[PDB]
Design an enzyme around this catalytic site. Structure first.
Site, PDB file in Angstrom:
ATOM      1  N   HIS A 138       0.957  -1.177   0.015  1.00 62.52           N
ATOM      2  CA  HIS A 138      -0.014   0.042   0.162  1.00 62.52           C
ATOM      3  C   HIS A 138       0.693   1.355  -0.117  1.00 62.52           C
ATOM      4  O   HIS A 138       1.184   1.647   1.241  1.00 62.52           O
ATOM      5  CB  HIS A 138      -0.944   0.176   1.284  1.00 62.52           C
ATOM      6  CG  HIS A 138      -2.220   0.924   1.015  1.00 62.52           C
ATOM      7  ND1 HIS A 138      -3.411   0.778   1.227  1.00 62.52           N
ATOM      8  CD2 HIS A 138      -2.064   2.231   1.145  1.00 62.52           C
ATOM      9  CE1 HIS A 138      -4.077   1.756   1.132  1.00 62.52           C
ATOM     10  NE2 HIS A 138      -3.357   2.947   1.293  1.00 62.52           N
ATOM     11  N   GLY A 154      -1.815  12.834  -1.610  1.00 63.43           N
ATOM     12  CA  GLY A 154      -2.506  14.039  -1.577  1.00 63.43           C
ATOM     13  C   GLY A 154      -3.384  14.435  -2.455  1.00 63.43           C
ATOM     14  O   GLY A 154      -4.053  13.781  -3.386  1.00 63.43           O
ATOM     15  N   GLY A 155      -3.730  15.683  -2.509  1.00 62.79           N
ATOM     16  CA  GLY A 155      -4.548  16.547  -3.384  1.00 62.79           C
ATOM     17  C   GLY A 155      -6.057  16.345  -2.754  1.00 62.79           C
ATOM     18  O   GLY A 155      -6.914  16.925  -3.595  1.00 62.79           O
ATOM     19  N   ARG A 191     -15.554  10.255   1.637  1.00 63.79           N
ATOM     20  CA  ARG A 191     -14.765  10.346   0.306  1.00 63.79           C
ATOM     21  C   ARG A 191     -15.097   9.258  -0.598  1.00 63.79           C
ATOM     22  O   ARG A 191     -14.796   9.393  -1.785  1.00 63.79           O
ATOM     23  CB  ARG A 191     -13.425  10.423   0.473  1.00 63.79           C
ATOM     24  CG  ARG A 191     -13.125  12.001   1.145  1.00 63.79           C
ATOM     25  CD  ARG A 191     -11.735  11.770   1.932  1.00 63.79           C
ATOM     26  NE  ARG A 191     -11.675  10.711   2.955  1.00 63.79           N
ATOM     27  CZ  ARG A 191     -10.615  10.078   3.653  1.00 63.79           C
ATOM     28  NH1 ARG A 191      -9.380  10.759   3.621  1.00 63.79           N
ATOM     29  NH2 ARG A 191     -10.521   9.337   4.495  1.00 63.79           N
ATOM     30  N   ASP A 236       1.549   3.034   3.747  1.00 64.51           N
ATOM     31  CA  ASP A 236       0.829   4.159   3.246  1.00 64.51           C
ATOM     32  C   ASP A 236       1.766   5.014   2.810  1.00 64.51           C
ATOM     33  O   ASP A 236       1.595   6.413   2.722  1.00 64.51           O
ATOM     34  CB  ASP A 236      -0.354   4.675   3.935  1.00 64.51           C
ATOM     35  CG  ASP A 236      -1.255   5.601   2.963  1.00 64.51           C
ATOM     36  OD1 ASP A 236      -1.358   5.433   1.876  1.00 64.51           O
ATOM     37  OD2 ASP A 236      -1.665   6.402   3.811  1.00 64.51           O
TER      38      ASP A 236
HETATM   39 ZN   LIG Z   1      -6.671   4.744   2.127  1.00 63.67          ZN
HETATM   40 ZN   LIG Z   2      -4.076   5.494   1.003  1.00 62.71          ZN
END
Ligand SMILES: [Zn+2]
Ligand SMILES: [Zn+2]
Ligand SMILES: [Zn+2]
Ligand SMILES: [Zn+2]
Ligand SMILES: [Zn+2]
Ligand SMILES: [Zn+2]
Ligand SMILES: [Zn+2]
Ligand SMILES: [Zn+2]
Lengths: 380, 388, 381, 384
Positions: free
Chosen positions: C63, C70-71, C165, C285
């Site tokens: 991942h 971002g953004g 989101r 991440d």
């Molecule tokens: Zn995520």
């Molecule tokens: Zn992520």
């Protein structure tokens, strides 16, 4: 919040005006005066005596890979996006972004979103649509739609001719693209031009000569760049200035000049030949991939280096400064840029007498103050 | 391009601040001060003593057919584009344009190009993408792309629910549209909301109630308008304020109120019920088609909606004892807050110099947009390109 | 192009094998033996005595925003692409890239081209297609085509559920996406799974529970990540391990943990509850946007930090190492990765006694040697 | 598995190196040495004495219908996909697949999926996108996208010119296609060339001559094949070698030669004329439909003609390394396959062991034996 007052500024607007008081507020130049303005302290953010130091417009770098360029010799050569300070620390307060050879993995959405990123970080940014190859890479279905509907998109570039990496564009394709850029420019008030990448092909500017001879399109629509990359091309570019084209000289680092001219040599030579300097601009190709025969990328630092080189050879500051400021703003129809004039954007450089940058203001905010970065990119 | 100084302004920001000197330049409010600023005459374009007259932010009319609306009862009912002065003379310094029922012959390109026309003429303008029907009318292939890439596009509207002219949208379609607007809003810093046209359908706000119960979408994403058009809808809209939605009341002319509330009656009733007035906005539906009737109820004449109903509403509610700042907020700060326009709706340093000077009866005397006078002593100084 | 011999390696394969000689050549592990191999000097590039130091497989970070993420709060928050050394110096020899919230301005072509860039620079890289929203962002017309035809594309991710989101995906949309990933996986031998971004929505893993109850799709196809971001979600994720899903725990930095568990706390708690640890992975991440309440981005450095934290609290090295290596390679069907085994790729870490990384080998080449970078990205200085 | 040692190999790399020990592991050539390497038995899979037999790189057949070709004289003439052993038993360890005349019923997805099938079965495979006709047959929307994003896709082919079955392509179309292949090649490190099918049209290589005269495109981007199919075409192809093009000679069986040259005759003639042989490759057109003559019977092209060509030219006095280069190093150089076509350390362990008459005795692909003492050890999934 407040007003900023710059006292005893030796103003190059870019033409020399002499000592002035310059008043800035709301991101704009509000006054340029001989008067020693007396203002209430409560409304003044900054009262600065420049003590006769040079004040110029910020540089407009109209050829930068703001997303990063490269990708021409393997995927590993994709350049990272240019951080804010790699423009502002070098006096670039407005950039015009473009895609180059890699308009396949990189999109107009990548480019336009980076324009908005640089605007959010406090500089000014525009971009070219279409890219290098045919058919054009655009955000919407056509270049004309991109230029009409997207405020930051000002024209088509950098479209390749006389280059082994071109799409081998035909005359009919080129003048159709030019017509779309021109019409979109008239509709919007924006540059409506085609910024052409020139390579080392011996056909040089033949497609543009044919367009000027056979069509009604105004000469300013055909804007070749890298014209200094080889001497026969530079000679042809200088001759065509009499037909009303603007030409863009690239500030190559000294390593990358090969068989051509440095920007400094090219500008001195255009002046010596009596060319109309108001039709000549200089750009850095910042973010462009720079191989060593290790891998690096182009920097906007070559613009000031060029200005120092030509001034050390006796060229007047206003001649080279215009090629980085007013001439670019005139061609690109940016009436708020490239000039110290009331109502224009407060994009300003304070230079030392050797033309080193001391301070950089963009839209009324200090990014660089006494050679220290005050503002930087989100991830710097 | 000198400074403008407004002395002895009774400032409604929109909250009352008392008497202030307000300095304007570069299109911005540069200072708000108790000090009687002394400036060099050479840099002052205009030195104006308001002598205690009221200064307010310019109105933000977030529901206007800037291209003209109509086309709902024949092609002849297509309204012409609203000229600049039909916003500015009525105190509207920012408009948010939309397509309505006719999102077939009218395009997002028509709408966005008129936004740029109004900006070129010196006012501020934004627009809604998507329109009234499903599938959405957009400039690019999707609403999310329109909001991400086109600076003036702030959200989706006006999307019809509970109306015979709707596309009979399903819950799953509505929350997908809302998700696209919300994500685009986060990416851009823009409103990122869905502006919903309500009709007289008895289902009222049921799709929005379900979205608030079943999804993680913030309540502010669901923004119903015309909530005053019938009383049961208005009651449901007021109840849902406690879940955090903003509601938009339409300033219908007195003729067009039918079985609902005027904007004035609706705002007075929300106040009487103790509703959170900061979540309530008023819009004009300017450029909307306005049919005129005789005594017999026959259709005799055709006009279009005007932004003039906003100030008429303000005069009506203030005459009934509502504080100026309560109704003024519904035209200014509340709209700017919901739509994430931090430069608008407020007399605050660094904000856009969009300002109204009012007479004692709240008639508009002067209108400034981006630091320029459009109206001065009730005379038009700036007008649209084709106005006479 | 000689052989490399690693003598007296304390091998965690990731299971402890004891002291071994490990022979590497042609980018592969050629031998693992008790024998003190004697080789002709002419064919040996490097003869290294590890003197009993730990040798592990390289970490697989499944991942990572290799293009930068971002953004989500303005265009200025677009993270730059992660440079090579921000994987390799932290022990990551294989990365799986994905798009997150911004699958609008970023494309699958951006992502896949960065996979090829990282491969050219000498690490291993794969990616997820589809992204976060519906409809899916793909290189070709569909996720199934992307997974069938593009070798590095292994599945769909990171597809958002229970998040403000998200695209508010419906059950029918989710199981269609899962069916396309699964079929493409069977056709290609690749992972063929859906990597789901979980948010803080109270519906938690409801869509996956419904898929497991109502369809024939194997449980391994449904792979939720960030399951440690809140405690009720983590408890539901641990309960669902008994249905055969794999769960991915995110190594948040200590600042970003909020109301959830750190990866370390989550893995220790799963062990205490008797959860099947072979079904648990950890990812960083990396390149994800990291707000301060300033702006920074996620780093693969949290993987080793997690390993040091849980081992200091009594977890066996092989348990947490498996969550970074063999478990990821098993779920993602990467048989050359995640293991010190003959025929596998020579992706290896040499650790100090405190588990600090001393050396990093990727495909038989040293990227890090005695904590100095030997290989770096094209544009690193 | 551990290491394979080949002792006493008479190495043609393809240039003659003399007797060497060759060490193979992890699918790669790890050492080429004069030393009689002594290794621990525990790490050695295979210790083989080649007893001075010739060791060559595997052949790279850059023009094969891996899906089967045909379909030019009725649907019944669709050739079946070429089984693995119909490459490996004939010394072909790398193939480059293409679509031919039928790029209508056959797709780039058919072609690319068969590339992956041959890779799963243990050989090396690439393919050409675009096919024979205009507009191009591609997997994605364009040839440039196919070459940029799909690792196995190396260029455009086989695009037809000077042929009654062509799309009558115009100069402007050809140089646009070449520009897309070239740019994609630079971006990826791959061949980035256009492989052109030539027919018997009297215009011959006119479009390529015009491209070389009028554009900046490098000469290597224009790669004509079947240049031996008629003598005037072959003469024009040989003359254009001085401009830097590579030319591909097809190893037709003796029946199919008609009014042209066999690959053997063409290569001997190029040598006699002093042509630069490093710019000349040979390919088989394996899986291509082969009608037998009135039309009586139907067969398909085989990679067996590559070795038959090598035996023919060597019997006429050509050095083994000259013809071997045309099947190995020259192909790998043009197609930018640095791991192929060479016995060199770090290269893929794709190797042939030849008898004294140049018959194939053993075939290794990626370090595994496919053929050992003329017996198939590895075969396709569905071969019996
Ligand atoms: Zn995520
Ligand atoms: Zn992520
Ligand atoms: Zn260029
Ligand atoms: Zn460039
Ligand atoms: Zn409505
Ligand atoms: Zn309306
Ligand atoms: Zn053929
Ligand atoms: Zn052919």
């Amino acid at each position: 919040t407040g007003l900023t007052i710059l006292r005893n500024a030796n103003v190059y607007a870019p033409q020399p005006l002499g000592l002035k008081t310059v008043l800035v507020g709301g991101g704009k130049i509000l006054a340029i005066t001989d008067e020693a303005l007396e203002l209430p302290a409560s409304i003044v953010a900054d009262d600065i005596d420049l003590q006769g130091r040079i004040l110029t417009p910020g540089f407009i770098d109209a050829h930068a890979h703001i997303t990063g360029g490269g990708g021409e010799a393997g995927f590993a050569t994709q350049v990272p996006p240019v951080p804010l300070s790699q423009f502002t620390a070098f006096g670039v307060t407005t950039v015009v972004g473009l895609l180059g050879t890699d308009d396949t993995t990189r999109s107009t959405g990548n480019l336009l979103s980076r324009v908005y990123g640089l605007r959010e970080e406090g500089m000014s940014a525009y971009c070219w649509t279409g890219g290098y190859h045919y058919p054009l890479t655009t955000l919407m279905g056509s270049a004309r739609e991109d230029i009409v509907y997207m405020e930051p998109i000002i024209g088509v570039g950098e479209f390749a001719i006389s280059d082994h990496r071109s799409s081998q564009p035909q005359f009919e394709e080129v003048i159709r693209i030019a017509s779309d850029a021109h019409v979109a420019g008239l509709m919007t008030g924006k540059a409506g031009i085609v910024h052409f990448h020139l390579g080392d092909g011996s056909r040089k500017l033949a497609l543009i000569k044919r367009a000027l001879a056979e069509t009604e399109l105004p000469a300013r629509v055909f804007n070749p760049t890298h014209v200094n990359r080889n001497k026969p091309l530079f000679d042809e570019a200088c001759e065509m200035l009499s037909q009303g084209i603007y030409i863009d000289i690239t500030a190559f680092p000294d390593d990358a000049v090969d068989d051509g001219w440095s920007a400094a040599e090219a500008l001195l030579l255009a002046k010596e030949r009596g060319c109309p300097l108001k039709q000549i601009t200089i750009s850095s190709d910042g973010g462009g991939c720079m191989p060593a025969f290790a891998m690096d990328f182009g920097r906007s630092e070559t613009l000031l280096a060029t200005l120092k080189t030509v001034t050390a050879q006796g060229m007047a500051l206003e001649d080279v400064l215009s090629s980085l400021t007013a001439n670019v703003a005139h061609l690109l129809r940016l009436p708020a840029k490239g000039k110290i004039a009331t109502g224009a954007d407060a994009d300003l450089l304070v230079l030392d007498a050797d033309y080193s940058i001391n301070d950089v203001m963009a839209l009324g905010r200090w990014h660089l103050r006494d050679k220290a970065l005050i503002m930087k990119g989100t991830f710097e």
